Write a protein that binds this ligand. Structure first.
Ligand SMILES: Nc1nccc(-c2c(-c3ccc(F)cc3)ncn2[C@H]2CC[C@H](O)CC2)n1
Ligand SMILES: [Cl-]
Length: 293
């Protein structure tokens, strides 16, 4: 099982949106890589569109490099830069709470990461801790929070018109229920606001250890999502964000954005960098997980 001229496929490492994950090696360069495989027989093929989105991003900071897309036996394969553990993995290592300092270092970076994605005319639509990975150990980039898995992304600027996509409502909801915006639950088309709201939910998950809508079950997926959305609507921001005034300010701001509105990314960063400085924290990448296995 080679992918392309030069990538050897090795052991299983994980799962993502519309594909499975192996360690690989570029034999020509003696460098390890990650390989996502999607069965060619897939009823709902997502890997090639994902490849196109990575190419549209180029590389910015925290964007994994993509090396190859092509067939591999009965699979389509995409070869990516190998990264380190996800924020969910690191959260588990840290007993499922992060310090304010760690959350702020994450948040400052991910506001910028999302601004970059939005600058390439994409919305992300799959915010979750499993999709944010540090770099590799002893790598120049173990400190950097990367974004992966663009299978659910969407162009929000139509390349034909150069205009923002129109507002509309949808039957099917995109993304992870725990983090999605309130408007996502209501079947609205997602836009830039929704990515930033989902980040806010994720930040609060890290600070609190959990979100209050986590334990909800139902007989249908639709009912489950409805109950989660209902709890999000029913939970005041001042309650969710007790003890974190700046998070309350962030969440209120993003929840109140118009569908078409460009977020004030500078404002949101400044909420958090002003807080960071006021607390006497140093931006030294000494996250909670440093010095753990
Ligand atoms: N360590 C690591 N390096 C780069 C990408 C991936 C990864 C990928 C991936 C995406 C597209 C590709 F072409 C290859 C891999 N999808 C999920 N992940 C990780 C998510 C976190 C999980 O605990 C392990 C797998 N993994
Ligand atoms: Cl290997």
């Amino acid at each position: 099982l080679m992918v392309g001229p030069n990538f050897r496929v090795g052991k299983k490492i994980g799962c993502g949106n519309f594909g499975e994950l192996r360690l690989g090696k570029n034999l020509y360069t003696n460098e390890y890589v990650a390989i996502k495989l999607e069965p060619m027989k897939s009823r709902a093929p997502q890997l090639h569109l994902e490849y196109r989105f990575y190419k549209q991003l180029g590389s910015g900071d925290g964007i994994p490099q993509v090396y190859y897309f092509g067939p591999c036996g009965k699979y389509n394969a995409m070869v990516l830069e190998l990264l380190g553990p996800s924020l969910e993995d690191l959260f588990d290592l840290c007993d499922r709470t992060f310090s304010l300092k760690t959350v702020l270092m994450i948040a400052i970076q991910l506001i910028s990461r999302m601004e970059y994605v939005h600058s390439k005319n994409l919305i992300y639509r799959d915010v979750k801790p499993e999709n944010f990975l540090i770099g590799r150990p002893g790598n120049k980039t173990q400190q950097v929070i990367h974004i992966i898995d663009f299978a659910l992304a969407k162009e929000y600027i139509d390349p034909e018109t150069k205009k923002h996509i129109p507002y509309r409502e949808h039957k099917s909801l995109t993304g992870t229920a725990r983090y999605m915006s309130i408007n996502t639950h209501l079947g609205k088309e997602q836009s830039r606001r929704d990515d930033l709201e989902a980040l806010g939910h994720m930040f609060m998950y890290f600070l609190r250890g959990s979100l209050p809508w986590q334990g909800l079950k139902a007989d249908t997926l639709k009912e489950r999502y409805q109950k989660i959305g209902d709890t999000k609507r029913a939970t005041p921001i001042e309650v969710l964000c007790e003890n974190f005034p700046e998070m309350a300010t962030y969440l209120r701001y993003v929840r109140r954005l118009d569908f078409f509105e460009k977020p004030d990314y500078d404002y949101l960063r400044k909420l958090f960098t002003d807080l960071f400085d006021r607390k006497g924290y140093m931006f030294d990448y000494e996250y909670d997980w440093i010095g753990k296995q």
